Structure formats: C-alpha cells, structure tokens
C-alpha cells in the first residue's frame, strides 16, 4: 500500500498511516483503507485494530483539497459507497461497522475528514500535550460532509457540535476528552504503552466476548442524520465561496507542513484576503 | 428603544444586553420585548450571531418575576400568542432555540430558574469561572422548571444529573456546569469577554450559507412530548398550596432584591422552615 | 435491626437509609436480591418516605459483584427469575427495580463496586463517590462474559457507546474522577466530605414541598431500555453458557475470589486465572 502499512500479530492489527507530506486523505488512501479494512473484517485471526500515524505532526490532515480535480477516481469510490451514505461518509461508516474493536492513537493534529476518522473509531486516546482535533470545513465555506456533524452530535451533543463546527477551532486533547469527542487524554510519553496495553488486553479476552459486547452495544442509528448532513453539505458547493477558498488555501500553502500547522489561521487570512475573478 | 434590553450590532454580531433593575427578573415586559427583538433580528441579513449579556453586575437573569401573576392580562396575551404545544414560559427558551442566527450567552453572574433555562436554550454558553452561577430554584418555590429547563437539562446533562440539578436546587458553579455539559465552557472572568468576542467575530465572518448548512445538519432537538409532559407536571405543582405560600413568603423576606437574590437558595429554604 | 440477612433499613424525617452488609466482601447473592426486592417494594408504597440512600457497612466494598456460586442453588434463583418483570432477566431486575422506584434514590459510593455492583450504582437516580477511595469496574469480560444486569445499557445511556465499549472491554477499575468525567456517576467528592454531602442532599430533597419529587420524576421519566436489555440478555446468556466462562469463574473462586484479599485487585486475579 502506498499510503499506509499494516501488520498483525497476537490478534492485533496495526494500521500506520503514512502519506507524505502531511497525511492528507486522498482518493488513493480512501481506496486502500477500504481494501485493508474489508480484508481484515474477514480475518478471524484479528480481534483489535489500532490506527496510528507515521507523520510526526499530523494524524490525518484533512481530505485532499485537489480531490475534485480527478472526478473519475472519486466516481469509482462513490460507486462502491453503501446506500444512503456519500463517498466521504463511507470512510467513517466503514470504521463504525468494523467487526474488530477499533482504537485510534492520536498524537498529532487531525482536521476535517481526519477528525471524522478519529471520532468514528470505537475508542480514541490522545496525547495531552500534542494532539489536536478540529472541523476545518466551515473555514473552507462548507460543513463536514463525512459524518462529522453526526458523530459530534452523538458524542458531544448538539450545543457543543455547533460550537466545534462553527468556531472551527483546533481543540486540544483535554477539551476534546471533557466534551466526549474522544475517550481520554493521556500524557504524550505514556500514550504508546497505554494503547498497546488496552489493545493487547482486549485481544486477550476469551473467544466471543468482543462479539457479544458489540452485539449488546450496536452502532448508532445515523441513517437520517447522515442524509441530512449530505444534503446540507452538497448545498454549500452550490455557492461560490467553497472553490474560491479551497483554491486560495492551496495557493497560500495548505497541504504543506507550515501551512497545516495553523490551518485555521491560514484559512481565515485567505477569507480576509478574498481573492476572486474579475471578468468585466 | 426597549425598556428591559439594549440592542446594537456591528460586523455581523448583534449584542442584546439584558437590563431590568433591580435584579434582572424576566417579567412580562421583557418577554414581549424579546419576542419583538428576536423576531426582527431573525430576518436581518446583516446579523449572523447574537450575543446575550447582562448589564447587572451580579445577575444575568434572576428568574421569572415572582409578581408576574399580579398582572395577569399582559401574561395572558403572551400565552394566547405562544406557539402550539408550548406554554408561555417555555416560549422564551423555544424562541431562542429556533433562532436562525447562532445564539451565544456570555454568563458572568448568577442565573436561576427561567434565567438558567434561557442560558441553556442558546446554541452556546460561555461562563466566568470565578463569578458565574446556574441553578434551578423552582423546587424551592414548590414547583419544577416550567420553561423547558427539565428537557434542556435532560438533553444536555442526562436524566441523572438533570434530577440532581432540579431536586437539589443548588447553585452550580461554572466549572461544574461545564463538566456536566449544562454550558459549553468555563473561562477565567478576565478572558471571557475576549473569548466570546473572538468566537462571535469568527462565526460572523464565515461565508454565506455556512451557518444555515450547519443548523440544517444539526436541527433543534425534538422536545414536543417532553415539553408537554413538563407543562402538565408544572401545572399540577403550581396548583397545590405550597407554591403561592412560598412565592409570597419569599417576596416578604426579600426575594427580588439584590440582598435576597445573593443566596436565594438559603432564603427559600428558610421561608419553608418558618 | 435483624429484619434481614444482608441489609439494615432505617427511616426518619422522609429519608430511608439502606445499609448493604453481607460479609466478607458484600457479594450480591440470591438472598440480597430477594431482600432488596422486598424492601424497595415496601418503601414504594410508603408515602412517608421521599428519599432512599444506599451505602455500605463494608469499608472496602460497596457491592463486590454477583455471587459466583449463585448457579449452584438453582431453586432460589428460579423463584427470583419466575417473578422478574417481563422482558427483564433476573439480574437486570435489580437495576430495573431501582430505576423505577418512586422515591429519589441516591448511592453513596466510598469503596469498590464491580459487575452487578457497578450496575446497581449506575441505576440509582444519583451517585456520589469518594475521590480517593471509590472504584467502578465491569469485571464481566475477564470472566468470559458481558454485563448481564443492565450495565451495558446503563453505560450506553450515561457515558455513550464509545466509552461503554471501553469500560466493558478493558474491564479496568475506574477511579471516581474518571467515572464522574465520563458521566457514569454524578460527582466525585473528597472522601472526608462525602458523608455530610450526601446527608445534606438527602435532607434537602426530603424537605421539598408535597408533589415536587413526583412532578420531577413525571417530567423526567425513566429511559426506555426495553430493546437494549433484551439484546444484552441474549449476548450475556450465550457467552455465560460456554465452558470457557465456567472455567474462569471456577478458577477465580479457587484463587481467592470473594475474599477480601482476592477482591482488592480482582482484575489482576482474573487475568492470572486466564493466563493459568
């Protein structure tokens, strides 16, 4: 795989996300994630999956801002998406319905679709000092269209969901945990051993226990919410701002490490600059 | 000009400053003015965000005016024009809950009863850690919250904590309210103004249609059955002898004065004991 | 004072106190389940009682977990089962009785509660715990099963599915601060203040005027958990039926479960049984 690596042993698969320079989620990663998770879902030797990043600053930056430039790659993904779920929601929805226990180890920054990925897993543990979660979408003239509005509604409640989405700020681990967006914030220097212990302890459970727990606690019914989000999100592309802001962002350094570090700041200054065409 | 509110706007943010001396009770006048101002603002394309704050240095909104039943005609007109299946008190929070703009409460001081209902109804509430307080005083006046509070709490904090807030009737500090999810965040008192201004400006700066899209994706909670159940529970308690005795006794012992409102919980417990 | 084997009940001024006392570690056995039903059914009909406070006589354990030998005397368990509510299993019947009680129910948690003990704590209207000393865990996964007394659904409602899965599958003992942050209990308080705190809340609620408690509960009715509880029963029943579960439980008893020394670190004890 070109955007990730997988290894498994002792009932735990580790999926390490590695797509330089900032771990954007592009069409290739979306396809490779589907392949790896679909294959694992049929592997009776694997009981737990742990997602981590190889990038020292970013878990998953956000969805590739150039993803709409090659609609054919996107059209192929959209054709394999489940009923009533859009091509972006299909990533989080695959994670949410995975048979294995899914665990995210979050050390760095995850925004937009990356933050959706984090919230979709069964459990997420984040480094107190270094981790960050933000829904950057509003600053690109859109809203989350990959399940984020609904994952937030369910985990943090509507009031805090609207705050996360509309302030579009980068939330630190301690705030994200107190909101319930992730399970726990832990010291950065303890996080790796903590997640390894949780994963191995869950994988050591007797046969059938994980299955029973997931049957007793089935995935939330989000069908109507995901449809509503899709409709609202689709409508934001019928307005000119989204493409102006996405183009302006790329011009000003989005999807480079310096540009992504304070993406919120970068996108607000792009909006303040307000460049656009003049066809007089 | 309004007699209980000051309204202004700039850079896409309307400020509504609550100003009804001596302790910022929600009376019939304020209820009428709020309907007018929020309905006017709902169709104002220049306004994206509404921030509520208080001109009183101790109280955000004390609670509903305990003398509001002395002038039944103004209250009855408001009741006659309330939305279907929403009582006249619930109509305050319900108007806030369905406002098109992002609604933000900046809570520096104490809010009880209907005041606490108002805080919980806004899209977001940020409170001063050292100075803010939230409580449902209703149980101490022999009733339960009848303006949406039971259902706002159920949604925000869960039934277990909602029963605790309602039946203990204690004044919660900002830190505990935020932990519970009753408000969004507790911030230092000397940072709250800047924090709220930054959030308000950032949301007002979002491009056309984003706020609308977010609210479409995150529609207001369906509370119809819960509000009707609260209404019937409230009417039943209000009809029993203790309610009017406690309300009259509280007024005689200094409720709705700043000295009485400071520790309203202790005052109302003492009224019941005496 | 000697009305019951596993409980002491007293009441005055509108507050009933139920002290849980079944040495050596406050296991929930068939006798406690029967006595709890008697006491709570009686109080439900007592207009003079407005608040029920549950606490423990055991300095280390609130309620350890359900008696690991409860299946050895099927007749006692059969009578309890035969008379459980429709769509509610015999273990769920304990939490469900507490959930539908007319009085305000309050748990004062100073020590450790696991399994059905944690389910009990979560079922009350409100639970206050000592920050320094209290602990809550769902041990069931380490015995080859899942919670079968409502705990999956009480966790789902109070902490959300994500944290419910974490609690159930890690099977660790959660401290009071973490449990409160998650919403599993109402609040963590200093150990030396907890008793006065709870007494104050109970007294204050009992002093409320006629009809207020009743109105509050009418406005905030118990969650509908019918389908969740049915699902939990089938998941629990299927795992419990397997030899692996039966050997883990047998080994736990062999290695000192249900003794104070074995119960202090039950998680470690049960992980050692499985490794052996």
């Amino acid at each position: 795989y070109s955007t990730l690596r997988v290894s498994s042993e002792h009932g735990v698969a580790r999926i390490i996300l590695d797509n330089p320079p900032v771990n954007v989620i592009g069409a290739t990663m979306m396809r490779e994630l589907r392949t790896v998770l679909t294959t694992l879902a049929d592997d009776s030797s694997v009981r737990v999956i742990v997602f981590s990043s190889a990038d020292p600053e970013f878990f998953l930056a956000h969805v590739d801002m150039r993803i709409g430039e090659k609609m054919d790659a996107l059209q192929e993904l959209a054709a394999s998406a489940p009923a009533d779920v859009n091509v972006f929601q299909a990533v989080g929805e695959l994670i949410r319905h995975q048979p294995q226990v899914t665990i995210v180890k979050l050390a760095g920054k995850a925004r937009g679709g990356g933050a959706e990925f984090v919230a979709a897993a069964d459990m997420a543990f984040a480094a107190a000092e270094t981790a960050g979660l933000g829904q950057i979408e509003a600053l690109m003239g859109i809203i989350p269209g990959g399940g984020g509005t609904q994952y937030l509604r369910g985990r943090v409640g509507r009031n805090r969901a609207l705050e996360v989405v509309l302030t579009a700020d980068l939330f630190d681990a301690e705030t994200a945990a107190s909101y319930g967006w992730i399970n726990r914030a832990l010291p950065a220097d303890e996080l790796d051993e903590y997640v390894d212990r949780v994963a191995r302890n869950i994988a050591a459970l007797p046969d059938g226990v994980i299955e029973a727990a997931k049957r007793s606690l089935p995935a939330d019914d989000l069908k109507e919410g995901l449809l509503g989000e899709n409709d609202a999100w689709a409508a934001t592309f019928s307005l000119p701002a989204a493409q102006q802001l996405i183009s302006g962002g790329l011009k000003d350094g989005a999807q480079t490490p310096a540009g992504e570090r304070d993406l919120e700041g970068l996108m607000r200054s792009v909006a303040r600059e307000g460049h656009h065409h003049h066809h007089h």
Side-chain angles (χ1 to χ4, degrees), chain A residues 1-74 77-173 175-280:
Chain A
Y1 304 110
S2 56
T3 66
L4 61 87
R5 289 184 293 288
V6 187
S7 62
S8 72
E9 204 172 62
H10 313 304
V12 179
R14 282 183 289 162
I15 298 176
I16 304 168
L17 303 155
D18 192 356
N19 183 38
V22 298
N23 273 21
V24 304
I25 305 163
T28 300
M29 188 187 288
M30 290 170 72
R31 179 166 71 260
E32 291 184 344
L33 280 163
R34 192 165 80 244
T35 303
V36 172
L37 291 174
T38 296
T39 304
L40 288 165
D42 285 353
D43 191 340
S44 43
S45 77
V46 176
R47 297 180 296 280
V48 177
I49 297 165
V50 182
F51 300 95
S52 68
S53 178
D55 185 300
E57 183 160 5
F58 305 100
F59 177 83
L60 287 171
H62 54 74
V63 171
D64 179 11
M65 284 162 78
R66 303 203 161 92
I67 202 165
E69 294 178 13
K70 294 193 186 272
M71 289 301 302
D72 60 329
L74 205 54
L77 286 165
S80 285
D84 305 309
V85 168
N86 78 36
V87 74
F88 299 106
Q89 296 169 338
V91 178
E93 291 304 285
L94 187 61
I95 294 162
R96 281 214 308 130
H97 297 97
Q98 192 70 26
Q100 285 83 10
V101 174
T102 53
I103 299 170
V104 166
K105 178 169 71 174
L106 180 67
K109 295 161 175 65
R111 298 182 178 97
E116 296 172 313
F117 188 120
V118 172
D122 295 333
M123 51 197 88
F125 300 104
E129 294 93 330
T130 55
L133 278 165
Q135 296 295 167
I136 195 75
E137 288 95 330
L139 301 182
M140 297 183 180
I142 63 167
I143 56 149
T149 65
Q150 308 306 298
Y151 305 160
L152 283 160
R153 189 173 193 140
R155 292 190 75 153
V156 315
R158 175 175 165 284
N159 296 104
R160 287 170 162 167
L162 279 169
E163 178 194 0
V164 167
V165 167
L166 290 175
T167 68
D169 284 321
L170 186 71
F171 284 69
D172 64 27
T175 311
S178 69
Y179 278 25
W181 199 355
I182 63 179
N183 292 59
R184 206 90 66 79
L186 294 155
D189 290 333
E190 293 167 19
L191 180 63
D192 293 314
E193 289 199 333
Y194 189 100
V195 172
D196 183 65
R197 179 177 67 76
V198 163
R200 291 297 299 275
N201 282 1
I202 296 173
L205 294 172
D207 281 338
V209 173
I210 294 169
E211 293 92 327
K214 291 219 171 191
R215 290 198 172 163
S216 84
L217 291 165
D220 271 269
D221 171 12
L222 307 180
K223 179 186 179 176
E224 289 315 300
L226 290 167
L227 285 165
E229 170 196 280
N230 176 70
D231 288 341
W233 166 83
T236 67
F237 295 95
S238 306
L239 310 169
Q243 185 48 238
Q244 295 173 354
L245 293 171
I246 291 157
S247 291
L250 284 165
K251 182 183 167 216
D252 288 359
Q255 305 198 167
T256 73
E260 295 284 326
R261 182 161 308 123
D262 182 15
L263 188 61
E264 293 77 16
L266 180 51
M267 295 307 309
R268 294 193 169 102
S269 70
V270 170
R272 277 198 297 283
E273 286 174 309
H275 300 164
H276 47 73
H277 284 267
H278 302 267
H279 294 309
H280 177 255

